[PDB]
């Protein structure tokens, strides 16, 4: 009967013009034992350890910035974020001597901060830690091709003149060439093609596909969205709504003067007879218009003037699919909206069945959308197959360290895993100074709900060790 209650007091800090909070029961005295929880959980992780630890030493156990209690300000939650905020919250407490219980995204905030200040560190336990792995077939196969997901985003598969065609589009937006698509520059054209979206509407299209967090577009998030998802009806509301743009008396046909307004009041180089040469490729039965069924072929299709056509109709069609809402990340998608890192990734964290009042608690702090920011730039940031680079640098510096640091190290670790397989925590058992590995049979990666009371037993007796 594992217990599944969060019986602590709450305390509260503010840094970086944020609040945190923090769980803080024990003796005042002595070297506090800081746990830092990963994702995507918080301190409800350590619910069932410190009781083991709290009696003799003190438990501090905060939730990371934008997660479990702490304040979610508008942040991309990079690991570089994570690192100024507790950074100033173990300055904020005014901590020194410190013992790290670190777990998943928490041991590469705890290793990262030991490496910086060495002589503060006096002991580190940890499980299921953030590695470095060079290919993608050492990442555990049955969470291979899910992981990916949340970072294969964009770049798919476009080659050719196709990344050449979406910068031309992309030019239609950025007149400052500023790289970024201002969230008024896009109701520039906008209102600039007939229409004229609130600013409400104009924001909400950009915050679905701001994975850079700058609140702006970039042309990576411009190809994301624009996706080779060709589905034969759902992908025909784009390119009639793109025929409504130029068809603006509803006849059915577009006019040369029709053809050149929405050219020509972008930014274009059209005069009275440099239409005619790209009417020849649309107008096939003679009419001198272009109909419907004449225009998705040139949408599906020498570039004298097809280089400026098919230049708009990619950015006409961005608009229609920018307005859909669902031109986001694929990724993000999985993790923000249908919310499958609680829903589907953490149950598969525990070999165990998680009770409901358990995963309830790890709803708590993720029951808006839009607070899930964390959730999807920390797989993100995993150093995986050399990327991304700042942070399989950073994580190859402090293992670095750790290999040569002769701090006491407890690790935890089970079968069969998913960061730490049975391989790996025996080399790191044989490998390590002071290093001394505990099995706890069946777990994966949130060791701690598949048997806590375990983990909270051997750091108890590897507590008195100094
Ligand atoms: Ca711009
Ligand atoms: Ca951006
Ligand atoms: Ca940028
Ligand atoms: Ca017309
Ligand atoms: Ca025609
Ligand atoms: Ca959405
Ligand atoms: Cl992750």
Same mark, same amino acid.
């Given at each position: 009967?594992?217990?599944?209650?969060?019986?602590?007091?709450?305390?509260?800090?503010? =840094?970086?013009?944020?609040?945190? +909070?923090?769980?803080?029961?024990?003796?005042?005295?002595?070297?506090?034992?800081?746990?830092? +929880?990963? &994702?995507?959980?918080?301190?409800?992780?350590?619910?069932?350890?410190?009781?083991?630890?709290?009696?003799?030493?003190?438990?501090?156990?905060?939730?990371?910035?934008?997660?479990?209690?702490?304040?979610?300000?508008?942040?991309?939650?990079?690991?570089?974020?994570? =690192?100024?905020?507790?950074?100033?919250?173990?300055?904020?407490?005014?901590?020194? !001597? #410190? #013992?790290?219980?670190? +777990?998943?995204?928490?041991?590469?905030?705890?290793? +990262?901060?030991?490496?910086?200040?060495? !002589?503060?560190?006096?002991?580190? /336990?940890?499980?299921?830690?953030?590695?470095?792995?060079?290919?993608?077939?050492?990442?555990?196969?049955?969470?291979?091709?899910?992981?990916?997901?949340?970072?294969?985003?964009?770049?798919?598969?476009?080659?050719?003149?196709?990344?050449?065609?979406?910068?031309?589009?992309?030019?239609?937006?950025?007149?400052?060439?500023?790289?970024?698509?201002?969230?008024?520059?896009?109701?520039?054209?906008?209102?600039?093609?007939?229409?004229?979206?609130?600013? @409400?509407?104009?924001?909400?299209?950009?915050?679905? =596909?701001?994975?850079?967090?700058?609140?702006?577009?970039?042309?990576?998030?411009?190809?994301?969205?624009?996706?080779?998802?060709?589905?034969?009806?759902?992908?025909?509301?784009?390119?009639?709504? @793109?025929?409504?743009?130029?068809?603006?008396?509803? &006849?059915?046909?577009?006019?040369?003067?029709?053809?050149?307004? =929405?050219?020509?009041?972008?930014?274009?180089?059209?005069?009275?007879?440099?239409?005619?040469?790209?009417?020849?490729?649309?107008?096939?039965?003679?009419?001198?218009?272009?109909?419907?069924?004449?225009? #998705?072929?040139?949408?599906?299709?020498?570039?004298?003037?097809?280089?400026?056509?098919?230049?708009?109709?990619? /950015?006409?069609?961005?608009?229609?699919?920018?307005?859909?809402?669902?031109?986001?990340?694929?990724?993000?998608?999985?993790?923000?909206?249908? &919310?499958?890192?609680?829903?589907?990734?953490?149950?598969?964290?525990?070999?165990?069945?998680?009770?409901?009042?358990?995963?309830?608690?790890?709803?708590?702090?993720?029951?808006?959308?839009?607070?899930?920011?964390?959730?999807?730039?920390?797989?993100?940031?995993?150093?995986? @197959?050399?990327?991304?680079?700042?942070?399989? @640098?950073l994580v190859e510096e402090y293992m670095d360290w750790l290999?040569?640091?002769?701090?006491?190290?407890?690790?935890?670790?089970?079968?069969?895993?998913?960061?730490?397989?049975?391989?790996?925590?025996?080399?790191?058992?044989?490998?390590?100074?002071?290093?001394?590995?505990?099995?706890?049979?069946?777990?994966?990666?949130?060791?701690?709900?598949?048997?806590?009371?375990?983990?909270?037993?051997?750091?108890?007796?590897?507590?008195?060790?100094?």
């Open positions: 009967g594992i217990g599944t209650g969060f019986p602590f007091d709450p305390h509260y800090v503010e =840094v970086l013009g944020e609040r945190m +909070h923090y769980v803080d029961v024990g003796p005042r005295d002595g070297t506090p034992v800081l746990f830092l +929880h990963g &994702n995507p959980t918080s301190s409800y992780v350590w619910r069932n350890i410190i009781p083991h630890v709290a009696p003799t030493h003190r438990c501090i156990a905060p939730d990371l910035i934008g997660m479990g209690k702490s304040d979610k300000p508008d942040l991309g939650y990079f690991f570089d974020d994570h =690192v100024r905020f507790m950074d100033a919250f173990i300055e904020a407490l005014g901590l020194e !001597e #410190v #013992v790290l219980v670190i +777990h998943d995204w928490g041991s590469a905030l705890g290793f +990262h901060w030991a490496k910086r200040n060495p !002589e503060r560190v006096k002991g580190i /336990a940890f499980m299921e830690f953030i590695r470095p792995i060079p290919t993608w077939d050492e990442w555990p196969e049955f969470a291979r091709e899910t992981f990916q997901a949340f970072r294969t985003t964009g770049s798919d598969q476009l080659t050719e003149e196709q990344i050449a065609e979406f910068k031309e589009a992309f030019s239609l937006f950025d007149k400052d060439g500023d790289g970024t698509i201002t969230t008024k520059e896009l109701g520039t054209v906008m209102r600039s093609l007939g229409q004229n979206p609130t600013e @409400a509407e104009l924001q909400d299209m950009i915050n679905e =596909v701001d994975a850079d967090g700058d609140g702006t577009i970039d042309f990576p998030e411009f190809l994301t969205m624009m996706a080779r998802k060709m589905k034969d009806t759902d992908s025909e509301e784009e390119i009639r709504e @793109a025929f409504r743009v130029f068809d603006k008396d509803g &006849n059915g046909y577009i006019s040369a003067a029709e053809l050149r307004h =929405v050219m020509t009041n972008l930014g274009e180089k059209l005069t009275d007879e440099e239409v005619d040469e790209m009417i020849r490729e649309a107008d096939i039965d003679g009419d001198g218009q272009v109909n419907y069924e004449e225009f #998705v072929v040139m949408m599906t299709a020498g570039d004298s003037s097809r280089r400026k056509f098919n230049k708009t109709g990619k /950015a006409l069609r961005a608009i229609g699919r920018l307005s859909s809402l669902e031109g986001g990340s694929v990724g993000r998608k999985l993790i923000i909206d249908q &919310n499958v890192f609680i829903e589907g990734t953490l149950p598969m964290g525990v070999v165990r069945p998680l009770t409901e009042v358990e995963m309830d608690h790890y709803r708590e702090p993720f029951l808006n959308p839009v607070d899930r920011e964390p959730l999807w730039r920390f797989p993100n940031e995993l150093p995986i @197959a050399g990327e991304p680079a700042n942070i399989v @640098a290999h040569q640091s002769p701090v006491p190290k407890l690790l935890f670790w089970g079968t069969p895993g998913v960061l730490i397989p049975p391989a790996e925590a025996a080399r790191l058992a044989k490998s390590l100074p002071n290093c001394k590995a505990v099995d706890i049979g069946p777990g994966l990666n949130l060791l701690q709900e598949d048997n806590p009371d375990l983990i909270g037993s051997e750091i108890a007796r590897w507590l008195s060790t100094l």
